[PDB]
Design an enzyme around this catalytic site. Sequence first.
Site, PDB file in Angstrom:
ATOM      1  N   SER A 117       0.851  -1.191   0.000  1.00 55.26           N
ATOM      2  CA  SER A 117       0.000   0.000   0.000  1.00 55.26           C
ATOM      3  C   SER A 117       0.905   1.266   0.000  1.00 55.26           C
ATOM      4  O   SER A 117       1.687   1.423  -0.916  1.00 55.26           O
ATOM      5  CB  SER A 117      -0.995  -0.075   1.168  1.00 55.26           C
ATOM      6  OG  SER A 117      -2.076   0.847   1.070  1.00 55.26           O
ATOM      7  N   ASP A 172      -9.755  -5.384  -5.019  1.00 53.88           N
ATOM      8  CA  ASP A 172      -9.388  -4.400  -3.989  1.00 53.88           C
ATOM      9  C   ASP A 172     -10.290  -3.140  -4.067  1.00 53.88           C
ATOM     10  O   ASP A 172     -10.317  -2.460  -5.092  1.00 53.88           O
ATOM     11  CB  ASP A 172      -7.901  -4.045  -4.127  1.00 53.88           C
ATOM     12  CG  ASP A 172      -7.294  -3.184  -3.030  1.00 53.88           C
ATOM     13  OD1 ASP A 172      -8.057  -2.494  -2.316  1.00 53.88           O
ATOM     14  OD2 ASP A 172      -6.062  -3.170  -2.917  1.00 53.88           O
ATOM     15  N   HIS A 204      -7.572  -6.099  -0.618  1.00 57.60           N
ATOM     16  CA  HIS A 204      -6.451  -5.270  -0.134  1.00 57.60           C
ATOM     17  C   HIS A 204      -5.803  -6.073   0.946  1.00 57.60           C
ATOM     18  O   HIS A 204      -6.096  -5.915   2.136  1.00 57.60           O
ATOM     19  CB  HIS A 204      -6.923  -3.919   0.413  1.00 57.60           C
ATOM     20  CG  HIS A 204      -5.808  -2.925   0.622  1.00 57.60           C
ATOM     21  ND1 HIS A 204      -5.199  -2.291  -0.443  1.00 57.60           N
ATOM     22  CD2 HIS A 204      -5.301  -2.425   1.771  1.00 57.60           C
ATOM     23  CE1 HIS A 204      -4.306  -1.466   0.085  1.00 57.60           C
ATOM     24  NE2 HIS A 204      -4.337  -1.506   1.414  1.00 57.60           N
TER      25      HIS A 204
END
Length: 224
Positions: A117, A172, A204
């Site tokens: 991320s 995601d 995610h």
Amino acid sequence: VLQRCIVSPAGRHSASLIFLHGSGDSGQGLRMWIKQVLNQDLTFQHIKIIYPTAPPRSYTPMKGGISNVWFDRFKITNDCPEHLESIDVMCQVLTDLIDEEVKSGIKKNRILIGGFSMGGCMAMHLAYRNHQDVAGVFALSSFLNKASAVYQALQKSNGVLPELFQCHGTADELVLHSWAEETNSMLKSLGVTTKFHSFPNVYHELSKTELDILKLWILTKLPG
Ligand SMILES: *C(=O)N1CCCC[C@@H]1c1ccccc1
């Protein structure tokens, strides 16, 4: 100074992996997350793993609330400017971490940077703007905002660039797959050699298949 979790190599140290956590996590938290996903710690024969922790700071999507975030964001979208001032502050802090690895005897071409991320975005800024001599870069469920300083830096670059290994889950809902694909397409059009791995039915998160093929790629970039 950055707090960190160090996972030693099994034998003689000849390469290093700087692995950056996602928003609200910590170095030990990511190491433990990877351990849960793989059902054992991620380890190498000659590669030392460095999991630093983002110092707590204000995070605008959390309404100024304090979180372990590498940098700030105005909104969760790729359609707004990136917050360059917070990114540049963290680029300097993480450059000191790379420099202490080099000082310890590891060549910059034996250092691989990457993250999950926010960690992936941070690794791309580090590699493509300041440390184009690293062994490679990896980004797991990450993206760059439109008009990123990374794109401007690559437009002005002429040398060989670190190869990018990028993974994303198609489902995601936090980082849209379209944002990660646009980032990968942008970097490719700018001269970056890339591998883009799209995982259907992955959200995610970290998957065991994703970490297994990431480990294999790291080993091609940092051979023993
Ligand atoms: C990962 O670290 N993330 C923080 C920056 C934006 C992308 C992603 C995220 C999106 C939405 C909610 C939590 C995290």
